[model samples]
Target: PLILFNKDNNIWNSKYFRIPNIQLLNDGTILTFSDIRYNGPDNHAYIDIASARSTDFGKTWSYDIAMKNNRIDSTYSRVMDSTTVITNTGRIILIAGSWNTNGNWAMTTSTRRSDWSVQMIYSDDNGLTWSNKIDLTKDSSKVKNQPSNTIGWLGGVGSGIVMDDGTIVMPAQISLRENNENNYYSLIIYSKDNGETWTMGNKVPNSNTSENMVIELDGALIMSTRYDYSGYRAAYISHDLGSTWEIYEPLNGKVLTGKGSGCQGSFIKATTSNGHRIGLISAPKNTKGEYIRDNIAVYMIDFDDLSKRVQEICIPYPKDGNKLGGGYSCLSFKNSHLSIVYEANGNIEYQDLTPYYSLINK
Candidate 1:
């Protein structure tokens, strides 16, 4: 089935789409997200968070719904980079970054929104409706804001995981506005009592980590981050939830190398059909020894005996160009089937990765 959210065929629109995210609701509904941009596809453009849900698990999809539409006001001009998490109580929280039009201050520099930061809009009815955005920095009641640092917060823009103990955790990024202007770190936002409240945890010790994916593996939370410094990514392991982190450069050499400067990927802890447990990391792979986001590679990771990895497969070359080829990916494991929504050939495509799930198990 074709799962492109920003399709311009029968619809015929010119908006650009980038950075896809996906989440599985408790009742088996699948929701996917992307940055629907007005001018362009990059961060410089005016981007809005858009989503389309599937009740039939990708046989079809609902039309694009504005999860973070700001065209009317432009007060919070860019509401891009978003992630969705489903709590134990069935509340679906759409967390993302918000900022004003300081982005388009063409002539001279202008003051940006002081409250520009990470926020959330939650829905109690399976994403059919949403609450007003709750900015954590401004002491939100729904999202408990105990206390925090870092002058800036951005949504992780990918997958979120709910632990076995019912804790909902979503990945995020922070800019140390006070400490150092150049310092950026990866972190996680979590809630204990379902979606009642959330608190930001300490950043990962590693600096310059961006748009990350989170998973609860074994007895710990594993965060795979985007590293632009080189052609590879980084992983942060947290034993005590997300309060503390130990950094590891698992993809430094060539494993999950980001074909380009850096790219975002999806990760999930999956139980194989044969009942074996493994971790899946889907990202752009440097298969042909080039520095471009052209192809995706699914790698099977085993961190039990000191981290083992095998490049299971590289999603074949697309029919079109990098206008959308081999960039972002989001994964959902349900009914022993792997559902993936990824950018390729200038469109977001959905595929059943269950066969590859079996191929990599052996």
Candidate 2:
């Protein structure tokens, strides 16, 4: 177990960092992203997404740094719950929701916040620097499925997957309808000519969905979201790249779970050494139907056979100490090795699935 970002370090006066996303660059640099909570651990606080890099895989990491377009020099503002996507043409884009006031989302609070901005911030120098905090919630005329006024919106709170056709799809949530009570829902926001312009798709079936991860499989987009009160992740399939969606089964992590109030888990596709396509996931773990944020477990499901699977390729136990248990996880795979940077024990932790992969591969 290697420590990447520690809460005790107090980097940026942020006593907390959560909801991590990791990705491997073409230049062999490992980039990790997370929310840097400024006020406190509460979801409704001043927060912004920050990133750190590891040149030698999980060996050592650079300091956490914020992007260029910082809007606030004070509290009660935020740009968080980021989802990073590295496209096929070597473009690194980070999509997140930006808001000025500190509070729960419109879905949770039932209050409207028109200041929400669905930002697409991209880096040109291979994750070294960033610019272009493009707002998808602008123009009110371009967004589909409702009236112009928006209450708010949110990011995937995880990571995004690039399609086979070069379209960049990022999972998102928005309150498009302008009712007295307001309306909030989950959907996909995509860009065809790179990250320049973004358009929204129809909202999924439910109203209580947010914090999602998009997976590209067999020419279809599968989104697994942390649906409210289900204690399990709800799934949806989009064939037209977020134009429409079909309901699927909720993911419960089998032995490990996030069912109590439903925690977000990172799901991404990769090829196994033996040549089987698999979806790797990192989520809160414990016994069957357990929802406590005790430990983080890694599980892999072969696309060939979902029923037969393997898990815990370096499973950290709650008893291992130092808050090594899991909460929200994001995964990145390169060269047949998987790297997970996640929130555990109120801090950020990194684990590489090499030793375990060696044993399992053989």
Candidate 3:
């Protein structure tokens, strides 16, 4: 059932990276994976994949860096946005954006950036001990035929879901940053034969603005994205896995109108133990112009309740002492208890959200 876990100092410094994804492994171990980012002197930064494990539910955790860039001083060579998945073979595999040597946006030049490749790091035993990194660009001989003629020169962090047959499908947020409004190259990654190979899946229409995350629900897949390049995040339903999508009209456009001020769209979702759909969205409710503040909230929508058309409940300003800046956030459920880990700003003036834990709405 829903049990409350401990919420201690379980966050990295409130500097570079944000947006963490969490899930409970098949073996009852809770896994939380996030991107590591740090700012340098030149205003440039690097991102890598990092993870933490909660053995006794979500109370305690063992945090460690799963991957790090050996090439130091290289502002361009680092792991950008990333995600992880548990394979059917009982292995933990992580895929992240690898910026070989391309400083910042690899889109400026037609030629692919040296660091613009998909990197993979796998662990055979649970979430411990990862293998040396493997670059997807190095395997051009295989993905040479991948859609978009882009080869493997794409790296944006994303989310994933394991199907019933053991095949793990990951959705990557690949887009042209400079011209997001009209970039078809932004899409998801498909892996049937495991993480050994990858291919571009159906493109997200208007997938621009911000990053994307996916989850399996009601025998279909649903996605949440940045709202019209604005604050609100939109939701989409995929009937044919990740092939095609139908954006939910009810949750689009004015989705973040009254409650959540349309600004940075940072929201994550997960299925509860009782098969309910719960989401934790980081939002700025009432803000005009440049000033952004903590108006984040949690939403619990019952899948079965939806079958009966029940109104979803949203908990605005959840009861917590953690000062959360409206940026990147995630949700994980264990034993009926829910733990939300998010990246906040500084102190009271900055919004320091120290990974709050709660037990509610079971």
User: CA lDDT, every prediction?
Assistant: 0.67, 0.69, 0.52
Report the C-alpha lDDT of model 2 over 1-362, residue by residue, as the tens digit.
67666777756777777777888776679999877776666665677777888788667777655543345636667777777888788888887777666656675445446566667778877787888576666765434453345567766777777787888887887665445565656788877777776677778888777777788888988777777666556778888888788885434324335445556777787776677777766666544333456566776666766667455555543422123223777877777676777776667778776666566567
Find the candidate with the highest lDDT and give its number: 2
TM-score of candidate 2 relative to the true fold: 0.86
Please rank every candidate by TM-score, starting with the best.
2, 1, 3
Error of 1 at 304 (Å): 4.7
Q: What TM-score quantifies how close candidate 3 is to the native fold?
A: 0.72
Worst ten in a row by lDDT for model 3:
346-355
Top model number, TM-score: 2
- TM-score winner between 2 and 3, please give it: 2
Best-to-worst lDDT order: 2, 1, 3
lDDT string for model 1 (201-267, tens) is: 7888767677887788766887878876566778878998888888655534335563445677777
lDDT of 3 at 285: 46
List residue ranges in candidate 2 displaced over 4 A: 68-73, 108-112, 140-149, 176-184, 249-259, 286-292, 307-314, 317-326
> If candidate 3 were superposed on the true structure by all CA atoms, what would the RMSD be?
6.0
Structural similarity to truth (TM-score) of each candidate: 0.84, 0.86, 0.72
Extract clashing residue pairs from model 2.
231-259, 295-326, 296-326, 323-345
